[PDB]
Amino acid sequence: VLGGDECDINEHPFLAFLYSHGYFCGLTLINQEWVVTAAHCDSTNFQMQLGVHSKKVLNEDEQTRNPKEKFICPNKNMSEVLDKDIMLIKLDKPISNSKHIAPLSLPSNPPSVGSVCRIMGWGSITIPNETYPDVPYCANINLVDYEVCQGAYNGLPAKTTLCAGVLEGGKDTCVGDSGGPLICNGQFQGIVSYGAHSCGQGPKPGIYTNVFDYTDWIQRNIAGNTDATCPP
Template structure:
């Protein structure tokens, strides 16, 4: 959470520092009006230098103010392996989406994560460090919800069947599906490795968690007029704004250690959005998920 007083203090210090350097550089050159008697080329040179300096000054001030206005990624590093159901979907060698382990053979993610050849990693915490707890599993098949609509993210749910069963241990555990819709005001947790695509330096290497509050459907629908259906739900980070981010798609929203939601979509870029994230309500898909897994063995 941002400390407002600290932010203002930091902003004031940076502006004072910039003003100091502005005054220093301006003191190196006489005022422009004293150069009128100089040769034309000299006058043009000083004019161009002054204009460039003024442009740099404005850019510096603008960048400082803009940087202070950006929201820091919400959340905190999850305690290592505290979310043992968390899975990572990889497209070739690149992290692509989040997911949740339902049992030894099935993983649940978002339908819009179904792009090309994918595989699944389980038991991971830091994506750039091999800790000996990871399981790298090939995919046998993907089953997208039959009524998935790519244009509006309706029924944005996909089951992923693993080619070989996951080994359950302290680092890899399945999560149960929620049986009923969460209530407005319920406190839950979202996790993932996602980050703002326009600020790649902010994408975390370790799994991040964020405490979120479930919003009423009516409250969220007012923020996304005409875009929300009854199979969707919203959750906002404490203090407001987006809780999940680009790259978190398909990841778990957990309430009372039950899989309540699946990260689907939201306002982008997440780094500057004040709107909540939108999730598929897993309680509405429970029957389809169970029937599909049973029918496919």
């Protein structure tokens, strides 16, 4: 993240951690059993770290889990990078709410453009470089036009995408923030997916998986409709 502050511990207990060779992707806890993230973030053999705050100091209660099950959109293009960039992860063992661990509630209404939302993660903190933080970082952005996504990125973003950024630039996600949350009013709204290098460019906002378009599919799976698919 760029143009922001180290994150407060009260605001990232939903953020999970994907590691095997090292660091792969951020994640979000939606409840004691289930974690969410981007399809693009699938690695073949990986694990979960819940409630990580500072590299320099491990708080009394990190939690390590494995992927019992995973799900991707059934109607998805297997090759095309960005279409339906979403994946659930059933943890092999349920997790409890403590200081450093707590779920994020799902969207009931979608975010009306021009709202002020919060991005976060362990990605690069800089415009050009790879400078990695010790605690996650936070920043306020706005939700913007679907034309300012299509004006910025000559490849058509999915009808199932959120567009956020700071019009004039200066606050954006970065290399390694993929699969992180975009939170608006206590509610989880978008999933970090792609943007541009360098981060923070004027009229070049970031692209997120429109969590609200798949909240039905999220729940369908969570109830047991393995057949169920996402809206094209």
